Amino acid sequence: LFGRAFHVDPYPIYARLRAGGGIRQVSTPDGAAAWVVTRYDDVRAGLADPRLSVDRSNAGAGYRGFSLPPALDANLLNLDPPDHTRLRTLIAGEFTPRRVHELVPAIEAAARELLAGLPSGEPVDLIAGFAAPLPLRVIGDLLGVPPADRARFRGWTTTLLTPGPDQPPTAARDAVVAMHGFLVDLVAAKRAEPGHDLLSGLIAVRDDEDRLSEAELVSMAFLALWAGYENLVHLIGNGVRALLAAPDQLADLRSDEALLPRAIEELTRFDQPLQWAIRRFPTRELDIAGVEVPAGDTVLLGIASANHDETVFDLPDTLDLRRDPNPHLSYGHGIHRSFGSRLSQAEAAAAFSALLARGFRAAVDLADLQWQPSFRNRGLTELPLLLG
Ligand code: HEM
Incomplete structure (x- = not known):
């Protein structure tokens, strides 16, 4: 079910769940239960449904904490309107497409520099050597981490979000405490000595005397770490593996540089890491996929399953970098x-782009790759490569 087969490849299980009607109540060995929703139409409608809340105040007595919001305290992903609308409007004032555009030259140079620090003709781990350092560097720049604090930041972010398979089970818990204090301290530093980073801009944000609080700023930083590191690290890792597993797609991409934007969208649809949206609670009894789901029950919307729904995508379990249209739900709705x-x-x-220009091939048989044991975030423990 949700064990070894699910961790190695979850899409055959998702196919069974969609074939079974697209909604099922699943239970842990301790009796914790949640509804898993797996068809594209129901996942898409669910994501945006105003009657499906992210606020635990609307959860019922059976609530046990599946697919929790990625931050402590009030944040975008545990609040409904109107409180959500306020935070979103405030953060959107600085988290802008222009900000991202202006970071692109630094992002591209950082990727080239990181890959260039890796030797050629020698087994190298793509995750620890490239796929993790690059987002870590970018999110550090985005949050304005000073160079003296980058080492501690890297150590705790990695322990928090990309644990080793044999990491002590308490280490990630302790990293929550460590990073909360780090982020509180970072907000204080930016409150005193502002820069041009997102955190500084978010402190400056004002809506007619309305401002973002320390807790709101720190919570937003945690959200950025979750998606800007944990999600992005394995979007890259899973994408490279998918390319190596489908040589003909890789050869087409290598022959057509203009294919890259559409190729990334297919790579995202194919094996992006996020399996479920944040848990949701019907504020009323709601018909989901043909079952009337009780108010307050826990509902898990299967983003990954939806991305492989054969009623939307032809041959969904095959990588097709020229797939068009590609209405994948990886970034929510x-x-x-x-x-x-x-x-x-x-x-x-x-x-x-940097990998394609350098040249890369698997240093091991892909069947020998190991996946991290997670229910929500699919990612590789390591990916040994040979660089050109
Ligand atoms: C590039 C770094 C990223 C940042 C800074 C980021 C930031 C955020 C933020 C702040 C939210 C909350 C928005 C809200 O609730 O109003 C969010 C939600 C979300 N992000 Fe990201 N994100 C990033 C990358 C990704 C990636 C790689 C994925 C996976 C493909 C992803 C998928 C999602 C989804 C599905 C949600 C909504 C969760 C839900 O509705 O239950 N994001 N992201």
């Missing part, structure tokens, strides 16, 4: 849709 669609697309393009 509705009021909570991702702030980072473009940023992710820019970091992915920089990462794949």
